[PDB]
Structure formats: C-alpha cells, structure tokens
C-alpha cells in the first residue's frame, strides 16, 4: 502493499 | 499492489 | 495491480 | 491490472 | 488488463 | 484488453 | 481485446 | 478484435 | 475483428 | 473480418 | 488483414 | 491483423 | 493483432 | 497483440 | 500484449 | 503483460 | 505484468 | 509482477 | 511482486 | 514483495 | 506493507 | 517481504 | 510493516 | 520481513 | 514493525 | 522480523 | 518493535 | 524479531 | 479458445 | 479457434 | 480461453 | 479454425 | 481461463 | 479453415 | 481464473 | 484466482 | 484468491 | 486470501 | 488473510 | 489475519 | 492476528 | 494479538 | 506462540 | 505460531 | 504460521 | 504460512 | 502458501 | 502457492 | 500458483 | 501458472 | 500457464 | 501457454 | 499458445 | 499457435 | 499458426 | 497458416 | 511447539 | 511446530 | 512446519 | 513446510 | 513446501 | 514447491 | 513448481 | 516449472 | 516451462 | 514451452 | 515453442 | 514455433 | 515456423 | 514458414  |  |  |  |  |  |  |  |  |  | 477506412 | 482508421 | 489508429 | 493509439 | 498509447 | 504509456 | 509509464 | 514508473 | 520506482 | 524505491 |  | 529503499 |  | 534502508 |  | 538499517 |  | 543497526 | 461451445 | 462448435 | 461455454 | 463445425 | 462458464 | 463441416 | 463462474 | 463466482 | 466470492 | 467473501 | 469477510 | 472481519 | 474485529 | 477489538 | 484447540 | 485445531 | 486442520 | 487440511 | 488438501 | 490436491 | 491435481 | 493433471 | 495432461 | 497431451 | 499432442 | 500431432 | 502433422 | 504434411 | 497426542 | 500424531 | 503423522 | 506422512 | 508422502 | 511423491 | 514423481 | 516423472 | 518426461 | 520427452 | 523429441 | 525432431 | 527434421 | 528438411 500500500503506497499512499 | 494498490498505488493510491 | 490497482493504479489510482 | 487496473488503470483508473 | 482495463484502462478506463 | 478492455478499453472504456 | 475491446475497444468501447 | 472488437470495435463497438 | 469486428467492427460495429 | 465482418463491418456491420 | 481487414484494414477499413471508416 | 484487424487495423482500422476509424 | 488489433491495433486501431482511433 | 492489442495496442490502440487512442 | 494489451499495450495503449493514450 | 499490460503495459501503457498513458 | 502490469508494468506502466504514468 | 505491477511496477509502475510514477 | 509490486516495486514501484516513485 | 512489495519494495519501493522511494 | 504500509508507505505513508 | 516489505523492504523499502527510502 | 508501517513507516510513516 | 519489514526491513527497510532508511 | 513501526519506523516513525 | 522488523530489521532496519538506520 | 518501534523505532521512534 | 526486531534487531536494528542504529 | 480451445473447443469453445455456443 | 480448435473445434468450435455451433 | 480452455473450453469456454456459453 | 480447425474443424469449426455447424 | 480455464472453463469460463456464462 | 481446416475441415469445415455444414 | 480457473473454473470462473458468471 | 480459483472458483472466482460472481 | 482462492474461492472469492461477489 | 482464502475464501474472501463479498 | 483466511476467511477475510467485508 | 485469521477471520479478520470489517 | 487472530479474529481480528473491526 | 488474540482477538484484538477496535 | 503455540496455540492448540485439541 | 504453531496453531493446531486436531 | 503452521496451522493444521487435522 | 503452512496450512494443510489432512 | 503450502496447502495441500490430502 | 504450493497447492496440491492429492 | 504450483498446483496439481494428482 | 504451473497446473498439471497426471 | 504451464497446463499438462499426463 | 504450454499446454500438452502426451 | 504451444499444444502439442503427442 | 504451435500445435503438432507428432 | 504452425500445424504439422508428421 | 503453415501446415506441412511430411 | 511439539505437539504429540 | 512439530506435529507427530 | 514439520507435519509427520 | 514439511509435509511427510 | 516440500511433499513428500 | 517441490512434489516428490 | 518441481513435480517429479 | 519443471515436469520430469 | 519444461516438459521432460 | 520446451518439450523434449 | 520449442519441440525436440 | 520450433520443430526439430 | 522452422520444420528442419 | 521455413521448410528444410
């Protein structure tokens, strides 16, 4: 996964 | 995976 | 995967 | 995969 | 894979 | 693939 | 593939 | 392929 | 293919 | 292919 | 291939 | 392949 | 393959 | 393969 | 492959 | 595979 | 794969 | 496998 | 797998 | 997996 | 996983 | 897995 | 995993 | 794993 | 994990 | 696992 | 785990 | 595990 | 594809 | 396509 | 797509 | 296609 | 894929 | 197409 | 996918 | 994936 | 995955 | 994953 | 993940 | 995760 | 994790 | 973690 | 961790 | 973890 | 994680 | 994860 | 993830 | 993943 | 994924 | 994916 | 994908 | 995709 | 795709 | 696609 | 495509 | 497509 | 974890 | 983990 | 994991 | 993972 | 993973 | 993965 | 993925 | 992947 | 992928 | 894919 | 693909 | 595709 | 696609 | 496609  |  |  |  |  |  |  |  |  |  | 010209 | 121009 | 030109 | 030029 | 250019 | 260029 | 040039 | 190039 | 290169 | 190279 |  | 290069 |  | 480089 |  | 290398 |  | 290298 | 039916 | 059918 | 039906 | 029957 | 159904 | 049959 | 259904 | 149903 | 389902 | 549902 | 349900 | 559940 | 809930 | 709520 | 339900 | 359910 | 189902 | 279900 | 189903 | 079914 | 069906 | 069916 | 049939 | 018979 | 059927 | 029938 | 038949 | 018969 | 029975 | 039965 | 039986 | 039996 | 048996 | 067997 | 036999 | 047997 | 047999 | 046998 | 035999 | 034999 | 033999 | 032979 998650790569805000 | 998810690239937000 | 999932490219936002 | 998935491109929006 | 989809390109929308 | 698929191309909206 | 699909090209809408 | 398909060209709608 | 096919082209409507 | 096919042209409709 | 079928190459249109549409 | 099929290419069109469309 | 198809490769459009649309 | 496909590979448009939308 | 599916390979665009948009 | 899928590979854009968007 | 998925593999883009965003 | 994705491995984009943002 | 992802391995992103932001 | 996951591994960025932020 | 998580990338804030 | 998880392993960054921040 | 988390890394803010 | 989580085993980052920071 | 947790890498503030 | 966590095994970082700050 | 924390690694503050 | 947690096993740093601070 | 491979033996499709319908 | 291989042995469509209908 | 292996047997697609429908 | 091969054999396309109907 | 593998037996898509519908 | 090869063998076409109807 | 395998066996998907829809 | 496997048996995806919907 | 393995048997999603919606 | 396994069995996700919804 | 195993049985993730929503 | 096991039955993560929301 | 296990039964995780909300 | 065992049955975490929140 | 060891967790059993026997 | 180690989590039997025998 | 080992999670059996004996 | 290991997760058998003999 | 191994999981077999014996 | 490793998934038999043996 | 690996996954046989022996 | 790797699927056999020995 | 690889898909024998032995 | 490889997909045989033998 | 390649299928062979020896 | 290749298909033989060696 | 290719389709020998030796 | 080629198509030999040799 | 040994988990004998 | 060991699961000996 | 080890799942002898 | 092992998976003897 | 490994299957033996 | 491995399936020896 | 190995399947051997 | 590997299919020996 | 490999198919030896 | 490759098929020796 | 390849088809040795 | 390739078919030596 | 090649045929050689 | 190539037919040697």
Wanted: aromatic share 34%; no cysteine; net charge neutral.
């Amino acid at each position: 996964x998650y790569s805000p």
